Structure 1
Amino acid sequence: AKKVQAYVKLQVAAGMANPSPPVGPALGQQGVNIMEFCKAFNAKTDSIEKGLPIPVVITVYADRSFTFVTKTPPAAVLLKKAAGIKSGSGKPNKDKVGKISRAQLQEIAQTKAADMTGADIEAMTRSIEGTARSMGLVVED
C-alpha cells in the first residue's frame, strides 16, 4: 500500500493459555488495551472460517477504539494439509522429502479464481507457486 499506518502485530501460539504480547508496551504505544482476543478468540475465528486457520490483524481508531480484520488464509496452511498428514513435512530447517505435484498446485490454484477470472488454470498454477519451496517442501516444475 502507498499509504500505510502499520498497526501492531499480535501473533501467539495455538491453544496457548497465558500469552504475553496482549499486555506488552507496543499496545501501550499504539494507545489501546486488549481484553478478549487471545484465550477463547478461536470461537471468533471459527465464526468467519472453519477447518482452516485464518490470519487476523488490528485496526485502531479514536477514543481507544479497535476493530479486527481478516486476511487471505496463506497457501502454506493448505500445503500443510494437502497430503493427509499432520503439518505436511512439519518444521522448516529440515531435510526435504515431501513433494508437491503440479496436480496438487492445481488443486490449491482454485484459491485465485475469484481474482484471476480469465479462465486459464495453468497460469494460476504458476501464480500460486510463490515461495512454494518454504516449509522444507519439494516442488514439481
Structure 2
Amino acid sequence: AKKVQAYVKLQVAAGMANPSPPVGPALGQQGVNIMEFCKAFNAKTDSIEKGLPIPVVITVYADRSFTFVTKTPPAAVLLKKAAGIKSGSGKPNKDKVGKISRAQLQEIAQTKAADMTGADIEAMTRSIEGTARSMGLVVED
C-alpha cells in the first residue's frame, strides 16, 4: 500500500540471536545495533512462539536506528517427526523410509495452514503430500 524502503530481511531462531555468522555482519553492514536487536527480538519472540524460526524484517533509518515486524514457518521437518524418522529417503519413491497416515497429513496441513495458500483443508493436505513424495514418505489412507 505504501512502497519499498531501506531495510533488511532475515529468518532468525525464536529465542536466540547475536552470533556473527548468522546475524551480526548481515545487518551490521547497514549500521544496525546488533546488541539492541538481539535482545529486542528474543524479547517478544518468546511470547509469540519459541523453537520455531521466525522471519523478521528489520527496517533501519537514517538515524541508523531500526524497527521490525515479526511473522511465520516450514514442512519436510514435520513429516520427519510424524514419520518418526531422522532424515529423508535419499532415493525418493525408490525406497520408502517411512509412512504417514492421511490423518497426520491433515494435522500438518492445519499447522502450516497459516503459511499455506490452500483455500480449503483438502487443498493444503494435497500440498503436504507433495513434500512427502519428495522425501520418500508414503501416506496410508
Distance 1:131 1:59, change over 3 A: farther
Secondary structure in structure 2 of the residue aligned to 1:112: helix
1:13-92 matched pairs, under 5 angstroms = 19-21=19-21, 24-38=24-38, 42-50=42-50, 52-76=52-76, 78-83=78-83
Structure with greater helix percent: 2
Structure with greater strand percent: 2
Secondary structure in structure 1 of the residue aligned to 2:27: helix
The question of whether the paired residues in 1 share the 8 Å contact of 2:101 and 2:139 is answered with: yes
The question of whether the paired residues in 1 share the 8 Å contact of 2:105 and 2:128 is answered with: yes
Secondary structure in structure 1 of the residue aligned to 2:123: helix
Q: CA deviation at 1:122?
A: 1.9
Percent sequence identity over matched residues? Answer: 100
Higher relative contact order (CA 8 A, sep 6+): 2
Output the CA distance in 2 between the equivalents of 1:87 and 1:76. 9
**Could you tell me the TM-score, scaled by structure 1's length?**
0.55
Distance 1:7 1:77, change over 3 A: farther
Measured against aligned partners, the alpha-carbon deviations of 1:57-95 in whole angstroms (never above 9, x if no partner) come to 423334222223233222345435435677899999999
Distance 1:106 1:76, change over 3 A: same
2:114 match:
114
Q: Which is worse superposed, 78-87 or 106-115?
A: 78-87
Ranges in structure 2 where 5+ consecutive residues have no aligned partner: none
Q: Which is worse superposed, 104-113 or 15-24?
A: 15-24
Equivalent pairs, count: 141
The question of whether the paired residues in 2 share the 8 Å contact of 1:60 and 1:67 is answered with: yes
Distance 1:114 1:28, change over 3 A: closer
Secondary structure in structure 1 of the residue aligned to 2:135: helix
RMSD (CA atoms): 5.4
Q: CA deviation at 1:44?
A: 3.4
The question of whether the paired residues in 1 share the 8 Å contact of 2:9 and 2:56 is answered with: no
